[PDB]
Design a protein around this nucleic acid. Structure first.
Lengths: 99, 97
DNA sequence: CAGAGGACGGGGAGCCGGG
DNA sequence: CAGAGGACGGGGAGCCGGG
């Protein structure tokens, strides 16, 4: 999904990228932290990030609704400065409504 | 304000099995070392009709759970291996017609 | 190191989790 | 075990990434 060959598409478009160069982050606490290049046997730290691409979300009933596309976040462990902590990684592009 | 597709988020700390980024089933180890830590994962997914707020007249629609990839310490034979596994991460709306 | 309401959700840092 | 195209997206295991 979306099942393209069947004509499907997201309400909000996203872009996904692998992030190998991360140096600072906001942690789960809401505080800014330094993220290490490598963690221990030894690995580079990589994060899969997915952001809103781009108004309004596609396919919305504008007679009843305001809408916008926004980036939501998950929490992924990372070695940070040394502590093993949850950090905010962008993860989807979802559609939020009102009025 | 609310989502077009309602999600539920939860902490999971009892994951023994998962699908890895290759598409293959793998065993997830209880704990990982540095001082030891349990592996917990943040998982978000759809709860449940179309999505909410959609122009029904013109569009079919459904809510679906999307996934991200998170490293975890996994069993590979008699060795430990640090592999990306698939984790539910959001609920989004897919359109058609 | 010390939870949860209203119906036609709730345990572990101002943390994660609204016709 | 060695990339990318139509236009009013592209590098590192069937892997990640459509009026």
């Amino acid at each position: 999904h979306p099942i393209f060959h069947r004509g499907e598409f997201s309400v909000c478009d996203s872009v996904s990228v692998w992030v190998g160069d991360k140096t600072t982050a906001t942690d789960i606490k809401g505080k800014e932290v330094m993220v290490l290049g490598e963690v221990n046997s030894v690995f580079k730290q990589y994060f899969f990030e997915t952001k809103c691409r781009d108004s309004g979300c596609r396919g919305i009933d504008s007679k009843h609704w305001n809408s916008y596309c926004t980036t939501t976040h998950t929490f992924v462990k990372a070695l940070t400065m040394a502590a093993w902590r949850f950090i905010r990684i962008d993860t989807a592009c979802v559609c939020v409504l009102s009025r």
